[PDB]
Amino acid sequence: KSWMESEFRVYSSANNCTFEYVSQPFLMDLEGKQGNFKNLREFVFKNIDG
Amino acid sequence: ASVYAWNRKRISNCVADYSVLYNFAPFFAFKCYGVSPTKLNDLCFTNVYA
């Protein structure tokens, strides 16, 4: 199974569905290969005055 | 959509160029409230509920 259906599904249907970011994945799911690797996807999450 | 079923489509993350909408029909009532449409063109807003 690889299709988008019956997924983890936490998003119980709500009302205030504000702006979105449907676009290219910012998390580059790079095809790790050739060994000697581990995708250290460092993410820094911060909210500056909103 | 009918008056009893009026839509609510907020416009954001895109440009609502008012110059295109200024000339759309032979006649219309541009009954903007608060600021004039000419001044509204040079008036950027957070989120417009259309």
mmCIF file of C-alpha atoms in Angstrom:
data_model
loop_
_atom_site.group_PDB
_atom_site.id
_atom_site.type_symbol
_atom_site.label_atom_id
_atom_site.label_comp_id
_atom_site.label_asym_id
_atom_site.label_seq_id
_atom_site.Cartn_x
_atom_site.Cartn_y
_atom_site.Cartn_z
ATOM 1 C CA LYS A 1 0.000 0.000 0.000
ATOM 2 C CA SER A 2 1.451 3.329 -1.142
ATOM 3 C CA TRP A 3 -1.644 5.389 -2.026
ATOM 4 C CA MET A 4 -3.082 8.310 -0.051
ATOM 5 C CA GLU A 5 -6.137 6.678 1.534
ATOM 6 C CA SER A 6 -7.195 5.528 5.015
ATOM 7 C CA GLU A 7 -4.077 7.225 6.341
ATOM 8 C CA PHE A 8 -3.023 8.346 9.831
ATOM 9 C CA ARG A 9 -5.857 10.895 9.650
ATOM 10 C CA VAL A 10 -5.759 13.148 12.695
ATOM 11 C CA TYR A 11 -7.392 16.053 10.828
ATOM 12 C CA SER A 12 -10.921 15.593 12.081
ATOM 13 C CA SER A 13 -12.969 17.920 9.895
ATOM 14 C CA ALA A 14 -12.952 21.488 11.211
ATOM 15 C CA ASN A 15 -14.103 24.991 10.228
ATOM 16 C CA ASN A 16 -11.243 27.530 10.215
ATOM 17 C CA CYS A 17 -9.122 25.977 7.462
ATOM 18 C CA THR A 18 -6.957 29.026 6.787
ATOM 19 C CA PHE A 19 -4.141 29.483 4.215
ATOM 20 C CA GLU A 20 -2.253 26.400 3.049
ATOM 21 C CA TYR A 21 1.177 25.495 1.646
ATOM 22 C CA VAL A 22 0.333 22.855 -0.951
ATOM 23 C CA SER A 23 3.566 22.989 -2.977
ATOM 24 C CA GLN A 24 6.881 21.193 -3.473
ATOM 25 C CA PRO A 25 7.910 19.226 -0.353
ATOM 26 C CA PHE A 26 10.154 21.302 1.877
ATOM 27 C CA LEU A 27 11.185 18.026 3.542
ATOM 28 C CA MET A 28 13.325 16.671 0.714
ATOM 29 C CA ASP A 29 12.688 12.922 0.884
ATOM 30 C CA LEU A 30 16.011 12.327 -0.826
ATOM 31 C CA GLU A 31 16.640 8.834 -2.194
ATOM 32 C CA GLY A 32 19.349 7.900 0.269
ATOM 33 C CA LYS A 33 21.835 5.530 -1.326
ATOM 34 C CA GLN A 34 25.529 4.541 -1.555
ATOM 35 C CA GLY A 35 25.576 3.897 2.194
ATOM 36 C CA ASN A 36 27.680 6.064 4.500
ATOM 37 C CA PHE A 37 24.692 8.303 5.108
ATOM 38 C CA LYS A 38 21.797 9.233 7.347
ATOM 39 C CA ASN A 39 19.524 12.082 6.336
ATOM 40 C CA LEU A 40 20.037 14.446 9.279
ATOM 41 C CA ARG A 41 16.946 16.491 8.440
ATOM 42 C CA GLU A 42 17.597 19.266 10.937
ATOM 43 C CA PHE A 43 14.456 21.347 11.475
ATOM 44 C CA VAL A 44 14.354 24.437 13.685
ATOM 45 C CA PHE A 45 10.782 25.446 14.497
ATOM 46 C CA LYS A 46 10.260 28.967 15.822
ATOM 47 C CA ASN A 47 7.357 31.416 15.979
ATOM 48 C CA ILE A 48 8.558 35.033 15.945
ATOM 49 C CA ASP A 49 5.755 37.366 17.116
ATOM 50 C CA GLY A 50 3.326 35.112 15.258
ATOM 51 C CA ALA B 1 -25.029 30.868 -6.025
ATOM 52 C CA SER B 2 -28.372 32.136 -4.778
ATOM 53 C CA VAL B 3 -28.818 34.710 -2.024
ATOM 54 C CA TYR B 4 -29.984 32.049 0.440
ATOM 55 C CA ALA B 5 -26.822 30.036 -0.384
ATOM 56 C CA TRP B 6 -24.189 32.754 -0.714
ATOM 57 C CA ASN B 7 -20.618 31.481 -0.946
ATOM 58 C CA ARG B 8 -17.686 32.440 1.284
ATOM 59 C CA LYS B 9 -14.353 32.225 -0.566
ATOM 60 C CA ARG B 10 -11.576 34.179 1.147
ATOM 61 C CA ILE B 11 -8.867 35.348 -1.266
ATOM 62 C CA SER B 12 -5.287 35.195 0.005
ATOM 63 C CA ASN B 13 -1.786 34.176 -1.140
ATOM 64 C CA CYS B 14 -2.770 35.691 -4.564
ATOM 65 C CA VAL B 15 -3.369 39.109 -6.253
ATOM 66 C CA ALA B 16 -6.935 40.469 -6.664
ATOM 67 C CA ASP B 17 -5.801 43.132 -9.152
ATOM 68 C CA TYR B 18 -8.579 45.705 -8.823
ATOM 69 C CA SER B 19 -7.738 47.226 -12.221
ATOM 70 C CA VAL B 20 -9.073 44.113 -13.975
ATOM 71 C CA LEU B 21 -12.266 44.209 -11.892
ATOM 72 C CA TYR B 22 -12.787 47.960 -12.391
ATOM 73 C CA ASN B 23 -13.993 47.359 -15.973
ATOM 74 C CA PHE B 24 -16.077 44.171 -15.804
ATOM 75 C CA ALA B 25 -19.680 45.086 -16.705
ATOM 76 C CA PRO B 26 -21.413 47.981 -18.492
ATOM 77 C CA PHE B 27 -22.717 49.219 -15.129
ATOM 78 C CA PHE B 28 -22.387 48.200 -11.488
ATOM 79 C CA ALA B 29 -22.730 49.557 -7.953
ATOM 80 C CA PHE B 30 -19.237 49.717 -6.431
ATOM 81 C CA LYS B 31 -20.702 50.448 -2.995
ATOM 82 C CA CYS B 32 -17.452 49.960 -1.116
ATOM 83 C CA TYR B 33 -17.585 50.880 2.572
ATOM 84 C CA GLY B 34 -14.906 52.683 4.566
ATOM 85 C CA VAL B 35 -12.456 53.559 1.782
ATOM 86 C CA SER B 36 -12.935 54.509 -1.854
ATOM 87 C CA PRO B 37 -12.182 51.859 -4.515
ATOM 88 C CA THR B 38 -9.595 54.137 -6.137
ATOM 89 C CA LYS B 39 -7.898 54.482 -2.752
ATOM 90 C CA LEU B 40 -8.656 50.808 -2.070
ATOM 91 C CA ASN B 41 -6.432 49.805 -4.991
ATOM 92 C CA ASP B 42 -3.539 51.421 -3.103
ATOM 93 C CA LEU B 43 -4.711 49.772 0.125
ATOM 94 C CA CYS B 44 -3.414 46.293 0.932
ATOM 95 C CA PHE B 45 -5.465 44.174 3.328
ATOM 96 C CA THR B 46 -4.842 41.093 5.440
ATOM 97 C CA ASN B 47 -7.601 38.717 4.308
ATOM 98 C CA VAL B 48 -10.621 39.584 2.165
ATOM 99 C CA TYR B 49 -13.728 37.435 2.675
ATOM 100 C CA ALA B 50 -15.236 37.417 -0.825
#
